[PDB]
Amino acid sequence: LADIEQRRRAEGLRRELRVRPPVAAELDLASNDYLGLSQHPDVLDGGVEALRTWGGGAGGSRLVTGNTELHEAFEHQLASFLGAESALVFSSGYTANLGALVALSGPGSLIVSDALSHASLVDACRLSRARVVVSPHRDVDAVDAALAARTEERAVVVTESVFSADGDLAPLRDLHAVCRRHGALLLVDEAHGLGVRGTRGQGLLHEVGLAGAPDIVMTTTLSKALGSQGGAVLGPEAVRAHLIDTARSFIFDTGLAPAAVGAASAALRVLDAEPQRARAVLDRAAELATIAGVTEAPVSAVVSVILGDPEIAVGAAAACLDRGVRVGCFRPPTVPAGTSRLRLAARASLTDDEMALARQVLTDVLATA
Amino acid sequence: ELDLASNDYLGLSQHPDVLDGGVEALRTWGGGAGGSRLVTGNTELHEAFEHQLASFLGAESALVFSSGYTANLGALVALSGPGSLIVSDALSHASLVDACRLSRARVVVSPHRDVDAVDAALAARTEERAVVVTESVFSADGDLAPLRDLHAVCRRHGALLLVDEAHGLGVRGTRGQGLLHEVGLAGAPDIVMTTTLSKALGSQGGAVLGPEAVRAHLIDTARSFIFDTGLAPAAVGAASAALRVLDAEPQRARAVLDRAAELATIAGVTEAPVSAVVSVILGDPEIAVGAAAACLDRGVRVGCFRPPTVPAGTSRLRLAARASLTDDEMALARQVLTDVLATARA
């Protein structure tokens, strides 16, 4: 009942408030539309055409024909682009993670999940009803130790390829080595890897040479680089079939709107035709990092700018905002108490003029902090 | 062929205004929303639709999710949690089980529409916080939940009532506002409602409706919302337009009932259907799939529930009514279903 109301008290008095409305007007360095494809003309046209062809939403789930030919065609397109045999779309990356992790583990199995994991995967781990071990961030030897000592026959090692927290890279090859050595599955969330890592933006798995691996399952969102909505699970065909019969986050879920599928497919075609875009987001990231005084070269789209106390940094975010530039802002308790930071999300579609605005605003705001 | 298996209850998925709304939304806001709705996703469009839907359903506030599934996850997880009690109806529990598991709460599963069982569960709890979860129209048999009784019992024990109106929206109510609104429970301070946008409203997504505090609470604490990139503008525009068509044309909501009755008449069912979907219980798990295959082979796709979904003695066909059903299609259904059922119950 009213229990809600002073668990407003506790976060009314304390540093947190929600939320805000836009309508396209200023410079956004906080979105994860890494390739700027969300508002690309061709993506808009693809979503519109798909919408006019199939209508709004669909109807049920599938094993032969519930949704559409559109979904399958896109699944094959994405799978072909990423080097996997099969793909299956979900309503979101969240539900894709739920479905995949639940279907590939279950009771009596082991899940080894990186500590800095997005959730998405914590809820998936809970929903899986498997034994969950949380291993230290990118600690390969810890994972190996967990896998070697297990009594459960079936094991899944879960990690992000590019971490949502700091944008750092996971040691996918080493992890896959320990996985194969102990007969474990490797499940990698490439939400921040797709369109960013790889010479052509195929993700970190493809970049480090693990595309098409028989014991690797990949998940990703369609809402970042591919600038749309929805999720996808990719891997060997058997994985897709298994998902089709068993996945409570897929059979009960009405799936993905045709418009989102068309937009994602178009975004994929533009990305495939323009590999330079994937380099462009990294280059822009580097530019932002140089503007912000960050010495560490960006390995992903997002640049973290650690300032310190949670009120010079929020002040920096407010000054940036009042000068037409919205940036990301992490503070306690989302991050450790001494590391309140700004977060700069690069996009491949950033023009030199927009970068000039960012340069002015960020230079001035940061110089006085 | 004739599809009697879809849940596009109002036939709005390809309604011209729905298409135009989605196209406009897409051309205005683009594909998806870049990020979540704590980033830059809370668009004027989402807010406007939430207010619109809340206004139509008589609720104070609404919050849209990427699906009805994630809407249920968010609502149930955020409003229960460790140290609380969840009382979940047995026949709605198989869609809501993931939410119950995710909730980290103590979960008691009560017999179908057994109000006194729920009361006994609420009275004997040690947890101050309790949530009773049910569907208004059950996906299993399309029957109605005793919402008024459940609410009386909830108020007796200071418990929250959580209702999934996925199959009630656009179907129950004089204007298709759902069962809660119909039995006079709209806008109740101790009732939270969820619904999909993918059935009657012929689009995609979910929504949680209730007191303003519920919405603010969800925005601040709901993990299937904060970590979720949300709902496409096109889906929101399509849903909004569908809602406007439904509000302007209540007869559609009446029509789906009428067709359902007709289907029930075709199948020999004596009870007038209380919802869009009609069950034809045959029996054995291959007299029913065989009947479904015969229907399919004569141009009509019907539903078929079997073990694990239903008890072994009641494997059945399911016929989903739509407002967009023509008299010609109803004639086809008459011919095919009468013929097949006579040959399945023989």
Swiss-Prot record, chain A:
Its cofactor is pyridoxal 5'-phosphate. Pathway: Cofactor biosynthesis; biotin biosynthesis. The gene is bioF. This is 8-amino-7-oxononanoate synthase. Belongs to the class-II pyridoxal-phosphate-dependent aminotransferase family. BioF subfamily. Keywords: Acyltransferase, Biotin biosynthesis, Pyridoxal phosphate, Transferase. Transmembrane segments: none annotated. GO terms for biological process: biotin biosynthetic process. It catalyses: 6-carboxyhexanoyl-[ACP] + L-alanine + H(+) = (8S)-8-amino-7-oxononanoate + holo-[ACP] + CO2. GO terms for molecular function: 8-amino-7-oxononanoate synthase activity; pyridoxal phosphate binding. It comes from Mycolicibacterium smegmatis (strain ATCC 700084 / mc(2)155) (Mycobacterium smegmatis). Its EC number is 2.3.1.47. Homodimer. InterPro entries: Aminotrans_II_pyridoxalP_BS, Aminotransferase_I/II_large, AON_synthase_class-II, PyrdxlP-dep_Trfase, PyrdxlP-dep_Trfase_major, PyrdxlP-dep_Trfase_small. The modification N6-(pyridoxal phosphate)lysine is found at K224. Substrate binds at R15, H118, T334. Pyridoxal 5'-phosphate binds at G93, Y94, S164, D189, E190, A191, H192, T221, L222, S223, K224. Catalyzes the decarboxylative condensation of pimeloyl-[acyl-carrier protein] and L-alanine to produce 8-amino-7-oxononanoate (AON), [acyl-carrier protein], and carbon dioxide. Pfam families: Aminotran_1_2 (PF00155). The lineage of its organism: Bacteria, Bacillati, Actinomycetota, Actinomycetes, Mycobacteriales.
